[PDB]
Amino acid sequence: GTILIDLSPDDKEFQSVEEEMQSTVREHRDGGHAGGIFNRYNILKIQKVCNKKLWERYTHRRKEVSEENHNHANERMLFHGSPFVNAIIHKGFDERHAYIGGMFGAGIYFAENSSKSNQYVYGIGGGTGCPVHKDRSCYICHRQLLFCRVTLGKSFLQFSAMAHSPPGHHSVTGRPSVNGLALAEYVIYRGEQAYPEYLITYQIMRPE
Ligand SMILES: O=c1[nH]c(-c2ccc(Br)cc2)nc2ccccc12
């Protein structure tokens, strides 16, 4: 059911997606251990992910959340990095894409910082890095992130340094409470609350 449509770099939609990728890079407390050392990316391709059935599954659930929250879905566009990006774009998000050991419990994790989602592209903690060179900071191999439409509804605010939502909430927000430069991370507990709208193929760039 999934088709991928390439965006032209001249397309304003390519440009606005690239800009959210680039402008949400930050330094990480592991010194680049999980995701590598870089201040920016080389964007190779941006594709729109089109699947009617998965879209309708998303919008069905979005309406449900919206009616439970004074007609406010509290929809965001957020990054997701995963070893399973290929399964996700073809079959949707579900429990097999959950971060069982995540700090806000077993759910599907998203980030405002593209560089945070980058840390998960090759697995939790970056795994063993790229399959070809075993390098978590590989500047050669092609990486992929998803830029996703995510329904948060009523989000439980956790201040801080698969399962269910907390009662009366549709998601969890992990608010950064130590690293003043960190953006928020979010967790949903239902695959139907995200749609993987853009597939972004890129390299991290070695700083000069
Ligand atoms: O973008 C993410 N991805 C994952 C992730 C974790 C485990 C697996 Br298996 C697959 C993906 N965790 C995150 C945790 C916090 C913020 C962003 C992310």
Ligand SMILES: [Zn+2]
């Ligand atoms: Zn490599």
